[PDB]
Enzyme design. Structure first.
Site, mmCIF file in Angstrom:
data_model
loop_
_atom_site.group_PDB
_atom_site.id
_atom_site.type_symbol
_atom_site.label_atom_id
_atom_site.label_comp_id
_atom_site.label_asym_id
_atom_site.label_seq_id
_atom_site.Cartn_x
_atom_site.Cartn_y
_atom_site.Cartn_z
ATOM 1 N N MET A 71 -1.751 -6.179 -2.368
ATOM 2 C CA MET A 71 -1.850 -4.974 -1.551
ATOM 3 C C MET A 71 -0.741 -3.972 -1.805
ATOM 4 S SD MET A 71 -4.619 -5.167 -0.049
ATOM 5 C CE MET A 71 -4.663 -3.959 1.281
ATOM 6 N N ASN A 72 -0.282 -3.912 -3.049
ATOM 7 C CA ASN A 72 0.774 -2.996 -3.445
ATOM 8 C C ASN A 72 0.498 -2.627 -4.903
ATOM 9 O OD1 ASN A 72 4.271 -3.330 -4.293
ATOM 10 N ND2 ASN A 72 3.032 -1.511 -3.856
ATOM 11 N N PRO A 73 -0.512 -1.776 -5.131
ATOM 12 C CA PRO A 73 -0.900 -1.355 -6.477
ATOM 13 C C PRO A 73 -0.040 -0.362 -7.246
ATOM 14 C CG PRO A 73 -2.117 -0.097 -4.933
ATOM 15 C CD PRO A 73 -1.353 -1.113 -4.113
ATOM 16 N N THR A 99 0.871 -1.196 0.000
ATOM 17 C CA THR A 99 0.000 0.000 0.000
ATOM 18 C C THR A 99 0.887 1.218 0.000
ATOM 19 O OG1 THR A 99 -1.888 -1.016 1.186
ATOM 20 C CG2 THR A 99 -1.652 1.424 1.289
ATOM 21 N N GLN A 100 0.537 2.169 -0.852
ATOM 22 C CA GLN A 100 1.304 3.378 -0.997
ATOM 23 C C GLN A 100 0.379 4.575 -1.155
ATOM 24 O OE1 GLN A 100 2.948 1.464 -4.930
ATOM 25 N NE2 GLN A 100 2.516 3.635 -5.405
#
Lengths: 233, 233
Positions: free
Chosen positions: A107-109, A1-2
């Site tokens: 969970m890291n788009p 997540t960013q």
């Protein structure tokens, strides 16, 4: 997540009788700071596909590198790389779609909204959208972010349903799209006046126009407006 | 000589040979004959099924890898299951990720590379089976010959297995003829059966003994066995 940092705003597009048009301004915003002005957010892939990207710019540059590799890789041991076995727009899209969904599932788009525009080998128009959630859809017109609210309503007045495609010419279409870019410059606080536009026609091929500008704006009536209610001067 | 340099695939003989690989190739020759040939619209696989007893079945020799691809085997059946299964995954991958059907030429390259790994490392063994791959892709009909050595070749027709040389000479002769059997599957298949019977000796191809498969322009790779091949005997 960013969290996105340097971002690109709207990407608008639509299809006409012989192909598709797609556009995006040249801005790379940094919050409310309109930091970078020479950002090209339209990525041509071969000569039948243009990928428009909005969202996080660092991720866009990463999608760029992925696209260049796809082209290189496709050429390997492929004597038909520039013929029957060249990259189709649908291949480019399905690939990106796949990546976008895998990345959200981890969970890291890739914080973007993408529109892939182009013409298939059999002449068909191709216009599909994919975003950081891996969600995808097609429509005669497609826009991301702000242009979804303001561009789509305009473009849809030209091509409301499928049957309107064959009745829409490149001229009418490019006009609609150029007007939409102006409207976005009027109401979107994260837009630039400069932009790139690209046409992918099953007959004329890919036409990529750089350094366009919103022109013919209406601001004169601003002088007649004073105060915010009762003020007279 | 040989005895000292054939204990494993990782050893070169003094003349530059790889006996384990060669011994594997031997398993193919001991396998029942199978033929492959193509025109410009179709590709056909004709394979002689072999039975253990007269109380046993005739082992299947054709495997479908996708709707547009399939192969025939000669040698260790288990190894064909492994290799075809891998080909099934590769075709599946191409579709799911790129929404593209896997090029027959690309499949050949993938099989070659998988076979090669088993000829350069200690511990493994070469595959002991030969494969004839046929398929219709974006460049037409195709036929490939796969050897455990890792060598894969594209041809108009060929045969592998015991007495395969009969059919092979027949095809190398009938070439100009069958290569033009476009738009007429039955004619191509008959030509296939005529080539395969050129390698008979023991018996004659019967109904539960003959196995045929075809793919092409408007024909998804399909397999015919028994009654279905009766009209060709």
């Amino acid at each position: 997540t960013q969290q996105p940092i340097v971002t690109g705003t709207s990407v608008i597009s639509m299809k006409y009788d012989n192909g598709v048009i797609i556009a995006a301004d040249n801005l790379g915003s940094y919050g409310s700071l309109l930091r970078f002005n020479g950002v090209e957010r339209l990525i041509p892939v071969g000569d039948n596909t243009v990928v428009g990207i909005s969202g996080d710019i660092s991720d866009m540059q990463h999608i760029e590198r992925l696209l260049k590799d796809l082209v290189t890789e496709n050429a390997y041991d492929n004597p038909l790389a520039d013929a029957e076995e060249a990259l189709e727009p649908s291949y480019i899209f399905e690939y990106l779609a796949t990546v976008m969904y895998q990345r959200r599932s981890k969970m890291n788009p890739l914080w973007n909204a993408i529109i892939v525009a182009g013409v298939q080998s059999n002449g068909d128009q191709f216009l599909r959208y994919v975003n950081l959630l891996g969600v995808t859809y097609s429509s005669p017109t497609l826009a991301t972010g702000f242009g979804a609210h303001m561009a789509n309503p305009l473009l849809r007045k030209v091509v409301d349903r499928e049957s309107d495609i064959p009745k829409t010419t490149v001229q009418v279409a490019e006009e609609a799209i150029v007007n939409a870019m102006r409207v976005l410059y009027y109401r979107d606080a994260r837009s630039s006046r400069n932009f790139s536009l690209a046409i992918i026609d099953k007959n004329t091929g890919l036409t990529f126009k750089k350094n366009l500008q919103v022109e013919n704006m209406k601001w004169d009536f601003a002088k007649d407006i004073k105060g915010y209610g009762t003020q007279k001067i | 000589f040989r005895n000292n340099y054939d204990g494993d695939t990782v050893t070169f003989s003094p003349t530059g040979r790889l006996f384990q690989v060669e011994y594997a190739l031997e398993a193919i020759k001991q396998g029942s004959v199978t033929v492959g040939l193509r025109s410009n619209t179709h590709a056909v696989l004709v394979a002689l099924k072999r039975n253990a007893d007269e109380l046993s079945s005739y082992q299947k020799k054709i495997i479908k890898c996708d709707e547009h691809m399939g192969l025939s085997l000669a040698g260790l059946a288990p190894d064909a299951r492994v290799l075809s299964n891998y080909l099934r995954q590769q075709c599946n991958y191409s579709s799911l990720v790129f929404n593209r059907k896997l090029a027959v030429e690309r499949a050949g390259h993938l099989l070659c590379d998988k076979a090669q790994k088993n000829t350069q490392s200690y511990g493994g063994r070469p595959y002991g089976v030969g494969l004839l791959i046929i398929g219709y892709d974006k460049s037409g009909a195709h036929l490939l010959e796969f050897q455990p050595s890792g060598n894969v070749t594209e041809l108009y027709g060929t045969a592998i297995g015991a007495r395969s040389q009969g059919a092979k000479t027949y095809l190398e002769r009938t070439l100009d003829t069958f290569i033009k059997i476009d738009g007429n599957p039955d004619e191509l298949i008959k030509a296939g059966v005529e080539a395969i019977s050129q390698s008979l000796r023991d018996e004659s191809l019967t109904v539960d003994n003959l196995s045929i498969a075809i793919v092409g322009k408007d024909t998804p790779f399909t397999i015919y066995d028994g009654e279905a091949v009766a009209k060709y005997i």
